[PDB]
């Protein structure tokens, strides 16, 4: 599921690693990150206008 597979993941299916990271307020299982706890098109909105700091679009 996706709209009902939120507790299954972030509740305790009874092993160390059966939590597979998913976007905080979403259900997308692929393209995710722990310390961001979100995804691609369930996260991007933030570094527009600054809600994520020091994010220049280019020029490393």
């Amino acid at each position: 599921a996706k709209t009902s597979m939120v507790a299954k993941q972030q509740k305790k299916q009874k092993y160390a690693v059966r939590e597979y990271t998913r976007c905080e307020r979403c259900g997308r299982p692929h393209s995710v990150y722990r310390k961001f706890k979100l995804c691609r098109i369930c996260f991007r909105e933030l570094a527009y206008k600054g809600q994520i700091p020091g994010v220049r679009k280019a020029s490393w």
């Binding site: 393209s31 990150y33 961001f36 691609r40 098109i41 991007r44 570094a47 994520i52 700091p53 020091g54 994010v55 220049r56 679009k57 280019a58 490393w60």
Partner: protein
């Protein structure tokens, strides 16, 4: 004491170095001056196309500024 300096912009950590130096300078101590450090970065790349479109991808990351200072006079003049 190895006090630390940490930031994400190129104007919030020069202030950190300078201003702790000055806080110690405003009162009597042979405290240390500005010791800058390089400008580091924290990358984060990820596909943007809502579908399976790729290779039209532009670099997307951030800049994590990390500086360091020593307080070379522990004093009861300007410590806190």
């Amino acid at each position: 004491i190895r006090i630390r300096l940490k930031a994400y912009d190129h104007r919030v950590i020069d202030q950190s170095a300078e201003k702790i130096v000055e806080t110690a300078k405003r009162s009597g101590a042979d405290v240390s001056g500005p010791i800058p450090l390089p400008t580091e970065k924290s990358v984060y790349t990820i596909i943007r196309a809502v579908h399976k479109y790729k290779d039209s991808r532009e670099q997307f990351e951030q800049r994590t500024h990390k500086r360091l200072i020593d307080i070379v006079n522990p004093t009861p003049k300007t410590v806190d």
